[PDB]
Enzyme design. Sequence first.
Site, PDB file in Angstrom:
ATOM      1  N   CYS A  64     -74.732 -91.529 -51.457  1.00 51.59           N
ATOM      2  CA  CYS A  64     -73.859 -90.608 -50.752  1.00 51.59           C
ATOM      3  C   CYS A  64     -72.760 -91.262 -49.888  1.00 51.59           C
ATOM      4  CB  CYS A  64     -74.740 -89.679 -49.924  1.00 51.59           C
ATOM      5  SG  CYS A  64     -76.342 -89.375 -50.736  1.00 51.59           S
ATOM      6  N   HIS A  91     -70.708 -81.366 -52.076  1.00 51.24           N
ATOM      7  CA  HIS A  91     -71.040 -82.788 -51.944  1.00 51.24           C
ATOM      8  C   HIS A  91     -70.868 -83.543 -53.264  1.00 51.24           C
ATOM      9  CE1 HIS A  91     -72.801 -86.430 -50.752  1.00 51.24           C
ATOM     10  NE2 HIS A  91     -74.084 -86.102 -50.747  1.00 51.24           N
ATOM     11  N   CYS A 145     -75.692 -89.630 -44.335  1.00 56.05           N
ATOM     12  CA  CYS A 145     -76.967 -90.135 -44.838  1.00 56.05           C
ATOM     13  C   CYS A 145     -76.805 -90.528 -46.306  1.00 56.05           C
ATOM     14  CB  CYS A 145     -78.088 -89.109 -44.647  1.00 56.05           C
ATOM     15  SG  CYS A 145     -78.014 -87.654 -45.691  1.00 56.05           S
TER      16      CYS A 145
END
Lengths: 397, 398, 398, 398
Positions: free
Chosen positions: D88, D354, D384
């Site tokens: 991520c 995302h 994160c």
Amino acid sequence: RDAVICEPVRTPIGRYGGMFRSLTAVDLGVTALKGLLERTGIAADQVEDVILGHCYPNSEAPAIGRVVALDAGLPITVPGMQVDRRCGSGLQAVIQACLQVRSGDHDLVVAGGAESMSNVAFYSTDMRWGGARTGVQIHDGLARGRTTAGGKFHPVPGGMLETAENLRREYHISRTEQDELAVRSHQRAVAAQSEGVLAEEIIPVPVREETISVDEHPRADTTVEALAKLKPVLLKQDPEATVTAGNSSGQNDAASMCIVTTPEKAAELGLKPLVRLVSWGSAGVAPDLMGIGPVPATEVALAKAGLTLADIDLIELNEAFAAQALAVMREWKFGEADHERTNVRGSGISLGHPVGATGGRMLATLARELHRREARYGLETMCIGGGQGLAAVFERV
Amino acid sequence: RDAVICEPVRTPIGRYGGMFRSLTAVDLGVTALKGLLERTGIAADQVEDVILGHCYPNSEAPAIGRVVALDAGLPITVPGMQVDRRCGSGLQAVIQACLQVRSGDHDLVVAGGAESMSNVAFYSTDMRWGGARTGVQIHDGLARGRTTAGGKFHPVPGGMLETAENLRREYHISRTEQDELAVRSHQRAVAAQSEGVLAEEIIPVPVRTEETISVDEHPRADTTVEALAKLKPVLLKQDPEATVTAGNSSGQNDAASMCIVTTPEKAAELGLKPLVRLVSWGSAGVAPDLMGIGPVPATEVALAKAGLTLADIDLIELNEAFAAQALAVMREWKFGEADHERTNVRGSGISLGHPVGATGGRMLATLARELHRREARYGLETMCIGGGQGLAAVFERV
Amino acid sequence: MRDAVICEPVRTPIGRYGGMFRSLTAVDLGVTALKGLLERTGIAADQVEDVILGHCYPNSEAPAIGRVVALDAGLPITVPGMQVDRRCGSGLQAVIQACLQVRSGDHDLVVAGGAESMSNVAFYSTDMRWGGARTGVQIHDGLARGRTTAGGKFHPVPGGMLETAENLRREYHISRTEQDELAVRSHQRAVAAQSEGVLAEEIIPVPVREETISVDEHPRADTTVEALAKLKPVLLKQDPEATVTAGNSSGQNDAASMCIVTTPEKAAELGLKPLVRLVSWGSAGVAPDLMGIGPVPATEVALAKAGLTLADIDLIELNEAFAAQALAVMREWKFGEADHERTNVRGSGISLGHPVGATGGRMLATLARELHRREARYGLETMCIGGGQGLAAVFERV
Amino acid sequence: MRDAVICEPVRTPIGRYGGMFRSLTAVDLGVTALKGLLERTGIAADQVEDVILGHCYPNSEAPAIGRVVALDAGLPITVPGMQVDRRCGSGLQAVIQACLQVRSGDHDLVVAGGAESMSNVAFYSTDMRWGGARTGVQIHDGLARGRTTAGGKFHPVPGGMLETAENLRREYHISRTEQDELAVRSHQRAVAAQSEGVLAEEIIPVPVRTETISVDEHPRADTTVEALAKLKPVLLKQDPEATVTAGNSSGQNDAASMCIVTTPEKAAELGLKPLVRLVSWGSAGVAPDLMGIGPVPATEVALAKAGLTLADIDLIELNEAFAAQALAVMREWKFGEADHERTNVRGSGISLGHPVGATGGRMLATLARELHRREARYGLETMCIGGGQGLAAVFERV
Ligand SMILES: CC(C)(COP(=O)(O)OP(=O)(O)OC[C@H]1O[C@@H](n2cnc3c(N)ncnc32)[C@H](O)[C@@H]1OP(=O)(O)O)[C@@H](O)C(=O)NCCC(=O)NCCS
Ligand SMILES: CC(C)(COP(=O)(O)OP(=O)(O)OC[C@H]1O[C@@H](n2cnc3c(N)ncnc32)[C@H](O)[C@@H]1OP(=O)(O)O)[C@@H](O)C(=O)NCCC(=O)NCCS
């Protein structure tokens, strides 16, 4: 009118992933068909249909009998088709061919079968509309078909081996009883090899170059103690499992062909009719007890022919597995002597089980062993995945 | 003893990726079979065999007739099997049913077909031993099978359609006439819908939403020659004179056909109503590049054995694989305008669809029911066959 | 603005495609090299601030694989890790990245490495999520497929890497004899390096279930120009004059590489013994069908940055992607027969193999170790890159 | 050494998974965004020296994807490029890498970005190379499969990153309502920003076949705690007390991000307006099942290096992979309801989506441009990382 069987031949039977792994079902089928026309010497336009059993068809060879016909160089006038009744497919293609000969529609047909189990496809029914929600599966054509054959209400997760353990358990068949049948099955085939009676059925096959004419699976050195050291395939699931690679029919590649015709036309063409169809029978049983299929089907065939199993001189029972075979012979209440008139050149355990080609192999030996024994009646029967049986009674000509 | 045909029925016919797309070939056959037994009211232990034409089998349903039998809740005493002669497989399954019933071996069997072209698998011959050196090719069963049916010595890259063009060419067939046929095709189907005769034919198919579908998905009322002329020939990019489009071609479709094959005695004994009996049948091999003309030799074989001519035949079902293909057969049949009025009276392949395996049983459902409706005597069902074959049966009303 | 030095560069053996490490994953191999690197050096695992891994064929088996290798090797959960891809130059890219990160002061000590299991590289499809109804379905070999798409839609190379090798063969008029001679010489140097015991200095023995493997599988004691001459070029059909074979190409292989990147001060603080330091590096782009000449401009960039010429360079690791490719490069460098004496001295891609992600750290391990035995000064590592790139780095003995 | 400034950070609109950009590949999106950035900055293509892209589901359709996006966007063959993955945080990683190699004096101008088409992540199999007769053959969804592998074999988490969110909900005693309130606030800021015309400078509009798209697919103005309250927690079957829904989760999505990384001089010479400079960055590893708390240790590393405290940060971007996760961070950050107004002022992962590899350059787009709009000084970018990592950069207004 009568339909007689002439020149029933087969390719050698290859192992799964073995001597024939290079050849397609069509390749094997073409070879047996050209081999057949070579022996009979009959004109290709004498052939009015090529009907083949073929249990794992795919689009490499749609309506395979017509493809095997065109790929063997038979004229574009020769029709062909594909049939599937699992293990029985090859006898089914012989019974159909007999029906359309005896009815006067056709005078001469080729009935046969072709299986390359080394090259059975993997496939998916999840790739056309999306695997987004459902995920995608890719099935082994062999494995998958062996759990789905009884439909959604009749699943058998462990396939044909689970059914063979079902019978083992039902009929209290010892593991030694099964390995005993296995060894003896090998002896007969090895003996038949050395006796040279198998050259009479076998159409040799050229591979990329070498020409093979011997079967791949039968072993000379097979023994009871040797078989004892093998692990039962489903032993994890079942502490009392008995069925192993050694007392099971294998997976295999072969093709089988024969001429089905009338006595007049056989005489005309210089053919030697071996047997004629007398009767046949089909039965359905529970998918999870498929192996006992041969009993109700044999009943029907014998009954149609007004005979009893006592009137039968020679028997071909496929033996998908020792346990299954022993369960059929138990129903039949067999003695040691009966064993000496059953599968006397081998069976599926020793010769292999190239499924769609198995019906035509039992026919080759049955028809031929009858004439050399000068016996009268012959029975051919086989258990069938999904819970069916099939038996034909043949008579020597 | 005779072989007679009772209560031949079918599902509606869905388009490819259409209304029956969540339904498998077994789903569709089970519906149709369950519908057959419900109408005929026969005990399920009376069925001695379920013989199905089915052209893209896979291991989701081995010897499919058996699986349809079980999944319909037929006794596990009922055998079944699967046959493939491409387009002709539903009639093949009938003829075989007639042979083993006329032989005296069986008194009653089920013959039919089942095809879900929507769910035909993708497959590979490269995964078993590994693509380490060769790679892994995956084939579309539908697409791959249009190339292979004639073998390696009779190649046809464009498949059945490329052969449909060849017939246009050898027979001098205009796009106009091709599209004129398609148009005729839809309004005979669309007619036959409003007249309420498809009602006797069709087993309504329930689908989860739950709705019941009972109307065919492809027929279109607004079809006209003008609208079709707008259509791009599928093989235009390779062929200048190309005429064959989606509009004068049969589509890919989803359906199942079911039928009772028994003797006149057994049917009397069970309160059945035999419609037609099998008079004769024939099969023929033609060139794989000219498959379309297969009905012509096959029909003559069937007619010869019957002692009939095409004049003796009052009603005709020809599957219209392509308009050019169909016209070429009619041109070989030296057809006129009145001949068209006896040929394909409820529609055909282009309007209704061509779910390969179930097609011989749709045609049978129509032939038998319409022969009865018109009190006509002889009907002829015939079909071209991929790979270059033809099958034909002659049926007579009872 | 501190230095970046390299400590204890090591590697697994290198397995053949489908060979001795086939049942082991990219992660398994990376876990072995890392545990061996920590085991030799004795460095505390929580001194490791990043595990940066070059890895050319990632998939969801092992996401951000440097992290996964760190975790599976038993390092604490506090150690971060990642994956980088620049094809053949990935393993060097990961070292260059580690150097940048250490010279800047952000980190003090990281692991730079690589890992490839070409034996287990995936087959894949971008057609199955929404279905191949309208497009069809492909299943792609990640190896072969990546080699034609690397240059994008405007520079496709249908014959992949071998095609580019042939292109360099034609442009530079490179004979089969030559390329076969280089390869023979490549195996000789490897097999000797092995016999002389120097390769064991680089190697972390691998447990495989149960035995321990410590010897490269790809080199051949028995390679000859005459044996090589027998082989048929992969692309002979496409090109009658093709010269690139299995024998004169790098292999596809399984291995992992790891080393410490740290500063002089930090190495000293832990009492580590740096082997070399980063003088300079350069990268460059070339025509994708000529990728194989990539090292020539990358090297020129690296030299110019360093105020050096190729004459200042005591040792060269130039990966032998293809003999045709390595020969072309040296031709631009105008190489002597004497120049081979300083170039790829214990073998390279053709003889030791080319586990793509790991090859950068193999070349570094040799280059850095061999700079110490010869007590040379400067070393050059450089690599052609599919898609048309090159990467070069100059290392100096500490 | 020299400074590194971020110029013109842009992105595509973010599409839903299976949404408006389903037809486009990651390369299609990366090209759209890179061309946008090039045309808006008017830079000559041959001035880009490296295209470094965060890409988290790479496959061989686009090897070393930075180079494929470079070439397919029409940059010269002389422009190198690559791919990086730290899950991520991948798009921030690319920024940090680009920064390192500009400040080092190596490059004067590179492109840093990220690109993901989660709509088109591949299906893959390790079971097709050496054959599947004894194992069977499995083919995995790259997205579904990645949900369980990121943490290796010693730190399993069956429900992946979502399960992780539940763990942070459980330990920090975070309520379903509090969670959902954040989601609403996430959506208002997204929609509000659209209306104020501030997004039009972040976004490069994306042409799709059969029109130009300029607006994100996932924000909805109508979002209420009430509506969100109705959704079922994804893992309720396992956990009676689950809170995490599709509504207070971040989504699967499609987008690319690009920006320019250069020197202050090079910017001036080229007419570029430098928005920010990278003060420092930090990474961290945390227990895989406590994944979402990664930003807590990585922020402290990055702040420490910068000589700042969390008070010194005027603007925070925190990717909110889940509501529960974000809040646990904010709790450890001791946030008060006033701190919420300097955090994610244009939305976050929950409202915009995302698109893993492109998230980093999205947060960077908003952070750079809102620091100039607000006349503020320091931005914090942190997220994160699945697998259990954290990454943060502190930027400064120029
Ligand atoms: C027979 C069958 C169970 C075999 O599966 P398999 O795991 O491939 O078995 P193999 O042939 O590989 O045999 C396993 C081992 O037994 C060995 N073996 C055979 N006979 C042996 C003996 N007497 N002593 C020692 N080993 C023996 C084989 O050589 C093989 O040895 P290897 O593993 O060392 O190479 C399977 O092929 C089968 O029967 N399936 C098809 C039939 C079916 O399921 N149903 C169809 C009928 S309805
Ligand atoms: C070249 C390539 C196609 C080889 O294909 P392969 O068949 O799978 O490889 P093999 O190891 O089986 O070699 C094939 C044959 O050549 C023989 N061979 C290989 N090297 C030999 C040598 N030095 N001397 C004599 N024979 C040799 C092999 O023994 C083998 O013969 P066999 O089939 O009888 O056993 C493959 O390795 C390749 O693509 N290499 C390039 C990898 C690459 O692109 N790396 C990236 C660089 S940018």
